[PDB]
């Protein structure tokens, strides 16, 4: 029932290889729905999910206007930050920005976000109050002063409490058949001997949405945190996600081990064991 | 829909 929208901007300079690339992508939860890329042959905002396609040409043009303006603005910001850090014109640098709104299960604004980073390090973030900034260092303090002068926090607050929430709600309704459908994981446990003395139990979760899941192994009902190999949740490429967790167990203590699976799509949490 | 104001850092 809990939903979010985010935009992710990446601006990357590349001295000697033309002007900085700007790319923006938009997500509702784990579903990407829009992209814009200053490097594309003809840069325009493009749909990346079926439910956004129904938006009319005035939506597409509005987005495209915004991201074109951002392309130019970020090129200036890259120049400025290079200066703030006394950096040479030789190196590539990246500004990243992620912002957006969280809704609770009732559809109300839980909180808003707007954070920027420079070469992968926190640089400036809007505080949870949506009215003040946290600047990481003396360079970011310069941006902070600029943004206070432009009344940025007040404008973001209005967006995050207003348009962000309204459009998220619209998208959730238009895409309700996928965005508000939780697909439970399909699960199974595999067993492969590693030697005479030990075997790997691997607990699989496939085909689930959204990406959030808990996979644990227990021995005698106690968590095996330090002994579980736990792979990053990965996209299947069809909107769904995959994950596995593995423990190496003594032969044949296999029945002492249980895999536990929590996910929104399940009627009830699962307890699985290896089934010879 | 994205935020519409740009501001140089």
């Amino acid at each position: 029932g809990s939903h979010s929208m985010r935009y992710f901007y990446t601006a990357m300079s590349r001295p000697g290889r033309g002007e900085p690339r700007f790319i923006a992508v938009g997500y509702v939860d784990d579903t990407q729905f829009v992209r814009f890329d200053s490097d594309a042959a003809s840069p325009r905002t493009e749909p990346r999910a079926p439910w956004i396609e129904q938006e009319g040409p005035e939506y597409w043009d509005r987005n495209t206007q915004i991201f074109k303006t951002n392309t130019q603005t970020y090129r200036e910001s890259l120049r400025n930050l290079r200066g703030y850090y006394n950096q040479s014109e030789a190196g590539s640098h990246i500004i990243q920005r992620m912002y957006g709104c969280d809704l609770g299960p009732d559809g109300r604004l839980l909180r808003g976000h707007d954070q920027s980073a420079y070469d992968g390090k926190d640089y400036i973030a809007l505080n949870e109050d949506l009215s003040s900034w946290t600047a990481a260092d003396t360079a970011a303090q310069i941006t902070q002063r600029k943004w206070e002068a432009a009344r940025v926090a007040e404008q973001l607050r209005a967006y995050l409490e207003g348009l962000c929430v309204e459009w998220l709600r619209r998208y959730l309704e238009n895409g309700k058949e996928t965005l508000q459908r939780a697909d439970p994981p399909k699960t199974h446990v595999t067993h492969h001997p590693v030697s005479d003395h030990e075997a790997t139990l691997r607990c699989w979760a496939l085909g689930f949405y959204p990406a959030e899941i808990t996979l644990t192994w227990q021995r005698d009902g106690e968590d095996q945190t330090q002994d579980t190999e736990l792979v990053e949740t990965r996209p299947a490429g069809d909107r769904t996600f995959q994950k596995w967790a593995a423990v190496v167990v003594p032969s044949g203590e296999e029945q002492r081990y249980t895999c536990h699976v929590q996910h929104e799509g399940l009627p009830k949490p699962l307890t699985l064991r290896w089934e010879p | 829909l994205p935020f519409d104001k740009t501001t140089i850092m």
Binding site: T10, I23, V25, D119, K121, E232, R234, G237 | -
Partner: protein
């Protein structure tokens, strides 16, 4: 400058069954900066027409991308992902394993 090396996973969209069309995935994540080179390989040779997702990043600022192509797994054809990044001295090859 602080750089982060990619995590790499190679896997199929659907559980693998020989002679049945499927998708071969290579997911690279946790890296910084964002430039990265990814190829999918069939018996050591680069596959053409491989597609990839749009550049995005995680809450820790690290980038991720999915590279994918249609393939039909067989008993003895070998699939792999070849990844290069600024953090790597030479490209890293991760082999496709059905049970991973």
């Amino acid at each position: 400058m602080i750089q982060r090396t990619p995590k790499i996973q190679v896997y199929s969209r659907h559980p693998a069954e020989n002679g049945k069309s499927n998708f071969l995935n290579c997911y690279v994540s946790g890296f910084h900066p964002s430039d990265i080179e990814v190829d999918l390989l069939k018996n050591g040779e680069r596959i053409e027409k491989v597609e990839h997702s749009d550049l995005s990043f995680s809450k820790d600022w690290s980038f991720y991308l999915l590279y994918y192509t249609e393939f039909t797994p067989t008993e003895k054809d070998e699939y792999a992902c070849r990844v290069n990044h600024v953090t790597l001295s030479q490209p890293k090859i991760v082999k496709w394993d059905r049970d991973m």
